[PDB]
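Pseudoperoxidase
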Amino acid sequence: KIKPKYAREDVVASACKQFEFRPDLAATSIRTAFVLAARRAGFPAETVDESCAVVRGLDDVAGIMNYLSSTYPASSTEDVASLAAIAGIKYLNGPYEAILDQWRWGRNDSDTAPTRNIPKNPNQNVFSIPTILHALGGLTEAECVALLACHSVGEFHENVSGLESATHTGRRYTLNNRYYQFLLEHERAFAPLTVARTQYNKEVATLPQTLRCVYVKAKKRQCVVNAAELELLKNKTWRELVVRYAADEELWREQFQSAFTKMIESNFKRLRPYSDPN
Ligand code: HEM
């Protein structure tokens, strides 16, 4: 039955309206697509030292998801969640047109036991970034690198990373290739950041130790990036992709949409090609 009950653009439009009153939840909804995919792949995170696939800071997003599901019953919650992430990209002026046009449906709301992969080294606790990203549907290195431009939007939260009033790149509301340009520009100025225990970050059981920081200007904005994200700039092939995306927005948009689609389809079976229900 090539028969979704609803039009995918209606769900996207309904999520966008929510974002119009809660603009901050667009980027969190995008992060949620990664959280879900990382969890299906066996990489749920406990610490942002590994990735932002932590379960924390998603209450308000779950609020919107519940609204969308009530609004669109008969849809699976997983399908709705992927469309909300896509709506986040749209809201944040990101490239989403191919992702939406090629969107497939039928994601099973399975009741699957959470799994956590175990590193080969007994004294290793965090997985590398390539290990995690490649596993989100079998991504190429180009797709992995393309996906990280989601860090060009959103911000840090006290119950997730343990700090507030910081972003990756100094901006929050445009999802483009500025991420790559930012990393390359400030690569050598990033310094270790100590995240202190405060009365506001108690939800973060173990504060991250690998965060690094630059202050960018007539006031300074605190810009924060994982040491691991920066260390990849030392890898030849990774860096050439960062350099390339910094200069070639068109190429980046293509790879981004291809990666994002693989991610939101990863570890789902029997997804169905979309047909207009009308
Ligand atoms: C795999 C390595 C990754 C690392 C180390 C990492 C690190 C982080 C950190 C520290 C934050 C701040 C979280 C907070 O305090 O709220 C963040 C936020 C965010 N990340 Fe990641 N991340 C990774 C992967 C990804 C991927 C693959 C995506 C998208 C597909 C993504 C999308 C986002 C978005 C949209 C935000 C902002 C969320 C918000 O504003 O609520 N990240 N990331």
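thats it. Residues 79 and 107 are 6 Å apart (CA to CA). The pocket of protoporphyrin IX containing FE is lined by residues 27-28, 30-31, 33-34, 48, 51-52, 57, 129, 132-133, 147, 150-151, 153-157, 160-161, 226, 228-229, 263 (CB under 6 Å). bye
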